Amino acid sequence: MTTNYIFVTGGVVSSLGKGIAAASLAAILEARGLNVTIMKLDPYINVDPGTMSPIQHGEVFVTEDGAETDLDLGHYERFIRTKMSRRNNFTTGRIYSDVLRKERRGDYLGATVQVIPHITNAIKERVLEGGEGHDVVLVEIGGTVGDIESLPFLEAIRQMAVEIGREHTLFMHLTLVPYMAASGEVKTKPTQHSVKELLSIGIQPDILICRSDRAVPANERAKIALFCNVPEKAVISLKDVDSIYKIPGLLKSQGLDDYICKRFSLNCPEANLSEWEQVIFEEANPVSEVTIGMVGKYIELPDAYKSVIEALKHGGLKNRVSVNIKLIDSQDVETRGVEILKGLDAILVPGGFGYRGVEGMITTARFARENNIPYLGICLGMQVALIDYARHVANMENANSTEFVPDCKYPVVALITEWRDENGNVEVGTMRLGAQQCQLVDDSLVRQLYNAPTIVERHRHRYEVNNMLLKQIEDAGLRVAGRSGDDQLVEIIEVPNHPWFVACQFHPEFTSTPRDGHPLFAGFVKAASEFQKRQ
Amino acid sequence: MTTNYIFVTGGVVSSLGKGIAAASLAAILEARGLNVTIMKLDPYINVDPGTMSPIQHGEVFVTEDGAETDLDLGHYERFIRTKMSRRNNFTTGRIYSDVLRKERRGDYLGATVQVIPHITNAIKERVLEGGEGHDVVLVEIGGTVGDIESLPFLEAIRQMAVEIGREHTLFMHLTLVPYMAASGEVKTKPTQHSVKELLSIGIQPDILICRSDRAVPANERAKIALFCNVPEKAVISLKDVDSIYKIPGLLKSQGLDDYICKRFSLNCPEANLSEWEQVIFEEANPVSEVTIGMVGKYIELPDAYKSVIEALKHGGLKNRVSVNIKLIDSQDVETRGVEILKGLDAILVPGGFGYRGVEGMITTARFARENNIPYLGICLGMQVALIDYARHVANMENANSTEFVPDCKYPVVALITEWRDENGNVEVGTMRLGAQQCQLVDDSLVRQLYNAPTIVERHRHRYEVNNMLLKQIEDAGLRVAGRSGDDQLVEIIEVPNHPWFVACQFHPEFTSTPRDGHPLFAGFVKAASEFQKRQ
Amino acid sequence: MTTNYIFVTGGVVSSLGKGIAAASLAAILEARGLNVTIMKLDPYINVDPGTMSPIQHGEVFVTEDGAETDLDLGHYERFIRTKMSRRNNFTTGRIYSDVLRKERRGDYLGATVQVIPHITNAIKERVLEGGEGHDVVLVEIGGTVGDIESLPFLEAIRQMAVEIGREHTLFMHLTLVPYMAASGEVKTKPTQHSVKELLSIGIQPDILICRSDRAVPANERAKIALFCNVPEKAVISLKDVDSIYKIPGLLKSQGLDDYICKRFSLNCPEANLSEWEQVIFEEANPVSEVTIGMVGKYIELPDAYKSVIEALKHGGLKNRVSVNIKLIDSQDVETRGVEILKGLDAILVPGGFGYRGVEGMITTARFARENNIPYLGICLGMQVALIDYARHVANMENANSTEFVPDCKYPVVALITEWRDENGNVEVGTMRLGAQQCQLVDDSLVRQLYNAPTIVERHRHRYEVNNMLLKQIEDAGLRVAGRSGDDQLVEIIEVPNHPWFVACQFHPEFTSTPRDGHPLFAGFVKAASEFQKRQ
Ligand SMILES: Nc1ncnc2c1ncn2[C@@H]1O[C@H](COP(=O)(O)OP(=O)(O)OP(=O)(O)O)[C@@H](O)[C@H]1O
Ligand SMILES: Nc1ncnc2c1ncn2[C@@H]1O[C@H](COP(=O)(O)OP(=O)(O)OP(=O)(O)O)[C@@H](O)[C@H]1O
Ligand SMILES: Nc1ncnc2c1ncn2[C@@H]1O[C@H](COP(=O)(O)OP(=O)(O)OP(=O)(O)O)[C@@H](O)[C@H]1O
Ligand SMILES: Nc1ccn([C@@H]2O[C@H](COP(=O)(O)OP(=O)(O)OP(=O)(O)O)[C@@H](O)C2(F)F)c(=O)n1
Ligand SMILES: Nc1ccn([C@@H]2O[C@H](COP(=O)(O)OP(=O)(O)OP(=O)(O)O)[C@@H](O)C2(F)F)c(=O)n1
Ligand SMILES: Nc1ccn([C@@H]2O[C@H](COP(=O)(O)OP(=O)(O)OP(=O)(O)O)[C@@H](O)C2(F)F)c(=O)n1
Ligand code: NA
Ligand code: NA
Ligand code: NA
Ligand code: NA
Ligand code: NA
Ligand code: NA
């Protein structure tokens, strides 16, 4: 069977729901038994998000293969069970970098290297590479139609549609249908103008996804159909919803997947969304409520912790608990003290880099440990927990990471090459990215929760637990719950004299889904519920 | 000095606030002592709105000279004291009608008559004729930039800017800056795309009026300025406000009138908005509250009663009464009965044509009269009041208008040329439009409200009170309060055994302003307040 | 079966060949046995070209039914045998006139009359009415894609394509592919930009007709196809040719009619272009050469005499005579005298209105008569011939038309209602338009040329031969060769003491075709050939 492509574009505005819409449509098609995948084409010049600030861009998502990618690939993995890799995300930067290397080498044989065909050919080659061996490939085009930055992507997919044929390619265009308070009407005019802009680049949209703060009524959908060369049944209402997990159902009920399967001549059973119906049911019917403090250094942009916030929500679903997530600036713990950590049923310290706000997180880890408040530490969260214990239990004064204080006496966290003891004595690829097997210690809390001896979780860090100083911290009562590799690096630590204290080096939020949840976050939210009840 | 033009255009959507923004800016310039006028260019093909139904594009406004115009001219008269005429409003229909007339009789001397220059020349001639010897002329262009229907208007004003020069012409462009709930940000992208659309038509905007449901922050305004070749100070925030009377102050506070006066080299004093501050103060400081029911056949589109709704609010300002306007379908009175007129402090029956919903209005007038509930009838409102009194007091069974039942025994309302008595005996440009003198009767409510023997009000009707059946209705207790012309046509009637029952042929709502109010509406709202307390 | 539409548009420039391309394609489809018609949509505001001067947009063509139309309908009748009528040509003026008429009398029932749907509906109705029960209807859109004036036509045909469906609608778009002298290459960039402009209006072209001063090579056609979403085989080369009669063959050789018949599912035999091959053969194989002078007042724009120039060429085909047409200003005859009529084998004085250049034509008719030079006078050409003979043979000094000198003693030409003799004595819809029967006199040139007692030819004139002064001119030797109607109006005159002197009221050029020729023009060109040899 020929691979089919759905090119997903956005008009009028960004922040429109392109990624969620693509992920939601992919979920419907996977629920019909189809082999589906999604890829994100980002128009920014960064070769990849590896170097990009969480505050500016949102979280850096990590795939099994260790690619640093757009957070949209997080949405993809939470909506479909196809595993994402490097091939599922690429930037304008990547494309120009590759073409420039081929040019400077001499691969183009003295030819003038042009946006067309050289840049467009490089785009098409990466789309085909990502799409090969799937029934349906959804290709999310970042940016807004009419902007300079996405034109090469739009010209590339236009060429692909002609080459491959309209029997195996569809253009799905999102637009904004805004509400005007004064007249009490939703407005199709931006959709009319956006479709003309998309046509002016050479693309006739097949499907229009109308985003609005309410349902787009039949009169407005008919008006959009009339002006845009699109049949009325291919003009789809996608209103603002209180849960994105409802969107697969909303799109199915408007026959979007029927329309797509008809165009692609795919004979497949009706979409079974029973698992999504269960997720929606669980979320709408919590029995208890908990407040969980997320104490970090990037709270000014919540999307910095997209996968963590979702993983906590998924913890709620499995326990039938409504999780109130309180984003707390760790620098406010440094300034105003531990007073701002009161009325929390649990505390989570997520990932981060740089010393700014870290002392606040160390204080937070101490507060949670001493007051028996459920604690989950992720990467930096497990560093500050180890530092807390080293300082305040093992009596290793001013214990720190070499990242923050390079020449500290007790570098409990440091690079493998930097490993030294308190006397400066030493033993006789630094960045860990992507999936790695971790061995769980018998009788550990995590061994019970994961219900297995070994687990596969994803890393994004280079600063490790210093094995030379570990024995002293272990003797002071701290437990090693997980290890990995030949160098037996510490992956998980637990404080046993505590209802629920777990900290891990890996990013468990990256394997959490609404349908399958996550053993660690489910345990954490349960502990939060049990704590809330005891008060 | 040379006449200055401000061309006001709208992008992204209609219902944007072009009329209110133009009127509000004109109010600031008038408060600086400038001779200012406004005109509306409507892209619809109707020669004028005389033929258009109210539920289509709102009320048909009537000027002193009897022109049937866009309701925007109502906004203009409520914001500036410059009186509107036929030359302050014209349509595409009017332009093509005039050019086709000239062409068919041979005025173009065998020339090919073209959109340019013949249609655009006709537009420029009407703009100049309406612009006269004013200091500043605001020219509001109907429709949305990028649509087919407004392109001749836009090409015309582009040519005017070049001819007159940019020292005496400004382009003021309104755009939508919508709020995205999920991201919590207002979006400048529609403004960016709309300005490029306006530029592609040959117009560089000088001023951007950014419409949003909240203030457009400095960052967003600075971004708009960066992409649109517009100075940051010429990017103006116009949020949704609870009162349009506040808009002159909000525009002044951002220096819009300073920018305009600087560009036009107009040395005039700072705007004194004391009159608007007073209107706002009155509105914000009511003493009591009333619920006035408006019972009509066009309530599905409130803009059908734009001037009447505003006139009732002005009535409130003058009494410090907060008027809750309840729009009631007259057909619901026919179905569900008088029960839906309960809990009303007053009843207004406004203008209308056709028999649909009229019997409900006659029932409504009966209820108001019999239960001593304050009543104001405008045009059709007076007809139904005369029919009510004819049927139920003067014992003229099945009394009606010839408009509704042509061959009724008692045509109490009819064309002057249809006037007959109950036996079919007779006496011996029916359409009355615009300002006409009315003589008031010595001992009437209206004589003491207007405090003058004669008044000037505006008509839009052909169906008159039948003088042949009047004397019998007068004997039954109905009072004629106002008459006009050689044919002594009945203009105002009153039911004297009632706290406040007045009904007029003319449209008093067209001469009501927020600053000067209206004697009749002030009296009506006062009567409503007295009934409210009395109960 | 369902009627099929080919919408013919032009990009980049006007004067592109839309009319000739449409007519040429229609000739191929007719040669496949298809029932085919063509209509012209003109974006000018003139209700019809009746009022337009010839020097503006060329000759006013007249159909059988007396419609005054664009000269394109002349191209249509010269290429297909389907007779044109009023419904094969309409203007923006006609559309707005009709919609304004309907609106003012209340046919739209209080609706806001808009470009869409009211103007576009009116366009679609006239296209369908003209399209009738034909197999294929070619719809030529005047103006250039991207201009304001054609946007309603383009929106209308876009809606038709959607409604009727793409199985019965094709978009054929003409573009300019200009030659750059310095680089020696033809440029596809204007085609690329024009197609994007057409797409931005909502129309994807199916066929691209590439106009150039030479063949568009495979590389350029392949490039156009790549950027325009058009199959390579649907990119057609239409070079500048020495004969428009070759165009049907050139389009057929590139498979254009095959592509169209495949898209429309039309099973019809291969086009037999034998009739066109014969015309081309005749044209390429002349035996002798003649110089015919055309003496008129509109020679500044040759298209003023489009049909007359073509009719003379058709006269050449039928005699195997190469006709060198010399355009001579009749005002130059007034200034420089008869000297500029030297070296002419024949003289044609065509139609015209107004006195400017008429005396030069009268002098021209005198020269042709006195020096036995073959003469054909059409309409004004006959008037000046009658005036010439009246003045210089019948001794009616200062004899003239009432059009030129209203109060002349001998008004030999005048309106029927102005008919008076030399003493001022009298007898007892003046505008004659379209096909009218003419009775020919037994012993006349025309009776033996037409070989019938009656003929049908087309009129466009109000000024008639004065029957009151005719008898005196007949006595002086002038022969009446043709008459018509109850008023026995003079249609044809001959000077019998002359090798070939004929002049007619009607426009015989409007019934001349390259395939069937015309008996009068064939005779005229033969007489020219005989004079050439005789000299
Ligand atoms: N139907 C919806 N209802 C409510 N929120 C939604 C809906 N669709 C998307 N969202 C939310 O809107 C935000 C943006 O969605 P998403 O990232 O998919 O859009 P996008 O077009 O890819 O944006 P950008 O390209 O600017 O990153 C997210 O917070 C997402 O959860
Ligand atoms: N700043 C504002 N705050 C609140 N309401 C507003 C504001 N400006 C305009 N409105 C309201 O919005 C509606 C449309 O205003 P207006 O008629 O001026 O717009 P417009 O662009 O001329 O509309 P249209 O093109 O549809 O005729 C009216 O109800 C008006 O009162
Ligand atoms: N292939 C061709 N070779 C030579 N001359 C041509 C060709 N096609 C058209 N012409 C000539 O070009 C001129 C314009 O042709 P035509 O009237 O069909 O164009 P058009 O696009 O309809 O023009 P306009 O829009 O200005 O009315 C005429 O003189 C015609 O004979
Ligand atoms: N390409 C187009 C499309 C439309 N229009 C003209 O657009 C006008 C309607 O303008 P509105 O009411 O603001 O727009 P709406 O389409 O209803 O969209 P919304 O859903 O945002 O309200 C018609 O007169 C027209 F004529 F139809 C136009 O001139 N050119
Ligand atoms: N003409 C332009 C303008 C911008 N951009 C690109 O637009 C991108 C930003 O997209 P966003 O965040 O949706 O746009 P915003 O301007 O901030 O508008 P909003 O106020 O609606 O959020 C940049 O990468 C860019 F590169 F700047 C572009 O490609 N071409
Ligand atoms: N939509 C497009 C299309 C092309 N190009 C760029 O256009 C460039 C080529 O420019 P040229 O040589 O003038 O264009 P040609 O297409 O060959 O047209 P002509 O037949 O008139 O010569 C490439 O670098 C490009 F990159 F291909 C572009 O930037 N955007
Ligand atoms: Na996104
Ligand atoms: Na609308
Ligand atoms: Na308005
Ligand atoms: Na932005
Ligand atoms: Na033509
Ligand atoms: Na080139």
Tab-separated table of N, CA, C and O in Angstrom, chain B residues 133-171:
chain	number	residue	atom	x	y	z
B	133	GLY	N	-15.965	72.759	2.914
B	133	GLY	CA	-15.001	73.547	3.702
B	133	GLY	C	-15.072	73.178	5.173
B	133	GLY	O	-15.505	74.024	5.977
B	134	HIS	N	-14.709	71.936	5.500
B	134	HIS	CA	-14.443	71.456	6.880
B	134	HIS	C	-12.928	71.431	7.088
B	134	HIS	O	-12.197	71.336	6.086
B	135	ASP	N	-12.474	71.537	8.337
B	135	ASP	CA	-11.033	71.436	8.696
B	135	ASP	C	-10.598	69.982	8.492
B	135	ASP	O	-9.566	69.756	7.832
B	136	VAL	N	-11.378	69.041	9.031
B	136	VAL	CA	-11.088	67.579	8.995
B	136	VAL	C	-12.351	66.839	8.547
B	136	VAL	O	-13.430	67.112	9.102
B	137	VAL	N	-12.208	65.946	7.566
B	137	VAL	CA	-13.296	65.062	7.056
B	137	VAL	C	-12.877	63.614	7.311
B	137	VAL	O	-11.875	63.180	6.713
B	138	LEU	N	-13.593	62.904	8.183
B	138	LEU	CA	-13.385	61.451	8.410
B	138	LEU	C	-14.232	60.683	7.391
B	138	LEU	O	-15.445	60.941	7.316
B	139	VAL	N	-13.590	59.819	6.605
B	139	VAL	CA	-14.224	59.030	5.509
B	139	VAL	C	-14.151	57.556	5.907
B	139	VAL	O	-13.061	56.961	5.792
B	140	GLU	N	-15.262	57.013	6.404
B	140	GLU	CA	-15.360	55.608	6.870
B	140	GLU	C	-15.655	54.720	5.659
B	140	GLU	O	-16.692	54.934	5.000
B	141	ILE	N	-14.763	53.773	5.379
B	141	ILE	CA	-14.903	52.792	4.268
B	141	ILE	C	-15.514	51.513	4.844
B	141	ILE	O	-14.839	50.846	5.653
B	142	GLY	N	-16.747	51.196	4.441
B	142	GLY	CA	-17.433	49.946	4.809
B	142	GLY	C	-16.723	48.728	4.238
B	142	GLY	O	-15.901	48.883	3.309
B	143	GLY	N	-17.034	47.549	4.777
B	143	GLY	CA	-16.406	46.275	4.387
B	143	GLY	C	-15.047	46.108	5.037
B	143	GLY	O	-14.669	46.960	5.879
B	144	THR	N	-14.348	45.034	4.672
B	144	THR	CA	-13.036	44.631	5.235
B	144	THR	C	-12.003	44.671	4.111
B	144	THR	O	-12.299	44.149	3.020
B	145	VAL	N	-10.846	45.276	4.371
B	145	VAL	CA	-9.721	45.367	3.398
B	145	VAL	C	-9.358	43.940	2.969
B	145	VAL	O	-9.190	43.084	3.854
B	146	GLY	N	-9.286	43.694	1.658
B	146	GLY	CA	-8.982	42.369	1.083
B	146	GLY	C	-10.183	41.770	0.371
B	146	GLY	O	-9.986	40.842	-0.435
B	147	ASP	N	-11.387	42.267	0.661
B	147	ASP	CA	-12.638	41.824	-0.006
B	147	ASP	C	-12.786	42.581	-1.328
B	147	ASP	O	-12.218	43.679	-1.462
B	148	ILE	N	-13.529	41.998	-2.267
B	148	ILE	CA	-13.769	42.556	-3.628
B	148	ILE	C	-14.548	43.871	-3.508
B	148	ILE	O	-14.208	44.830	-4.220
B	149	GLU	N	-15.549	43.910	-2.628
B	149	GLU	CA	-16.631	44.930	-2.650
B	149	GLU	C	-16.085	46.337	-2.361
B	149	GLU	O	-16.701	47.290	-2.867
B	150	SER	N	-14.972	46.474	-1.626
B	150	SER	CA	-14.434	47.784	-1.164
B	150	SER	C	-13.272	48.263	-2.046
B	150	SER	O	-12.817	49.399	-1.832
B	151	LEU	N	-12.813	47.446	-3.000
B	151	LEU	CA	-11.590	47.754	-3.795
B	151	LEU	C	-11.723	49.088	-4.540
B	151	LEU	O	-10.781	49.875	-4.531
B	152	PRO	N	-12.855	49.410	-5.211
B	152	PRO	CA	-13.005	50.720	-5.852
B	152	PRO	C	-12.922	51.906	-4.873
B	152	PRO	O	-12.297	52.896	-5.215
B	153	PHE	N	-13.520	51.790	-3.685
B	153	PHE	CA	-13.407	52.814	-2.610
B	153	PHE	C	-11.934	53.009	-2.235
B	153	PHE	O	-11.501	54.162	-2.106
B	154	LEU	N	-11.190	51.911	-2.071
B	154	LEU	CA	-9.775	51.930	-1.610
B	154	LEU	C	-8.882	52.538	-2.698
B	154	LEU	O	-8.024	53.361	-2.348
B	155	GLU	N	-9.085	52.162	-3.964
B	155	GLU	CA	-8.340	52.728	-5.122
B	155	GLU	C	-8.633	54.232	-5.216
B	155	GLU	O	-7.673	55.004	-5.426
B	156	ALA	N	-9.898	54.632	-5.042
B	156	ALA	CA	-10.346	56.045	-5.073
B	156	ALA	C	-9.590	56.862	-4.016
B	156	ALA	O	-9.017	57.894	-4.379
B	157	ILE	N	-9.575	56.415	-2.757
B	157	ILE	CA	-8.960	57.184	-1.630
B	157	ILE	C	-7.430	57.167	-1.763
B	157	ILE	O	-6.802	58.156	-1.352
B	158	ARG	N	-6.845	56.108	-2.334
B	158	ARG	CA	-5.393	56.059	-2.652
B	158	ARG	C	-5.057	57.216	-3.604
B	158	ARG	O	-4.084	57.939	-3.327
B	159	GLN	N	-5.840	57.387	-4.672
B	159	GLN	CA	-5.640	58.454	-5.692
B	159	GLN	C	-5.786	59.834	-5.037
B	159	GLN	O	-4.985	60.728	-5.370
B	160	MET	N	-6.774	59.996	-4.152
B	160	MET	CA	-7.027	61.259	-3.407
B	160	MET	C	-5.787	61.625	-2.585
B	160	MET	O	-5.386	62.802	-2.630
B	161	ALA	N	-5.208	60.660	-1.859
B	161	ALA	CA	-4.016	60.864	-0.999
B	161	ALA	C	-2.871	61.441	-1.843
B	161	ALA	O	-2.276	62.445	-1.412
B	162	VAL	N	-2.614	60.855	-3.017
B	162	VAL	CA	-1.540	61.287	-3.964
B	162	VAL	C	-1.840	62.716	-4.446
B	162	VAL	O	-0.932	63.562	-4.346
B	163	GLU	N	-3.056	62.965	-4.945
B	163	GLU	CA	-3.496	64.266	-5.527
B	163	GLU	C	-3.420	65.383	-4.480
B	163	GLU	O	-2.722	66.378	-4.732
B	164	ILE	N	-4.142	65.222	-3.370
B	164	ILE	CA	-4.254	66.223	-2.268
B	164	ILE	C	-2.894	66.341	-1.569
B	164	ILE	O	-2.542	67.455	-1.143
B	165	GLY	N	-2.166	65.227	-1.455
B	165	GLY	CA	-0.859	65.158	-0.779
B	165	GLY	C	-1.002	64.673	0.651
B	165	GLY	O	-2.101	64.808	1.221
B	166	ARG	N	0.086	64.156	1.221
B	166	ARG	CA	0.088	63.448	2.527
B	166	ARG	C	0.166	64.450	3.690
B	166	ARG	O	0.034	64.022	4.853
B	167	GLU	N	0.345	65.741	3.391
B	167	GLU	CA	0.290	66.839	4.394
B	167	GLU	C	-1.172	67.105	4.790
B	167	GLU	O	-1.380	67.748	5.838
B	168	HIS	N	-2.142	66.631	3.994
B	168	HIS	CA	-3.597	66.828	4.248
B	168	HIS	C	-4.392	65.517	4.140
B	168	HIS	O	-5.636	65.601	4.075
B	169	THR	N	-3.734	64.352	4.157
B	169	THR	CA	-4.411	63.025	4.128
B	169	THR	C	-3.705	62.053	5.079
B	169	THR	O	-2.462	62.019	5.076
B	170	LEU	N	-4.495	61.306	5.856
B	170	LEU	CA	-4.041	60.238	6.786
B	170	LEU	C	-4.880	58.985	6.540
B	170	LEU	O	-6.101	59.120	6.299
B	171	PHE	N	-4.249	57.813	6.626
B	171	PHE	CA	-4.924	56.491	6.579
B	171	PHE	C	-4.957	55.914	7.992
B	171	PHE	O	-3.886	55.583	8.521
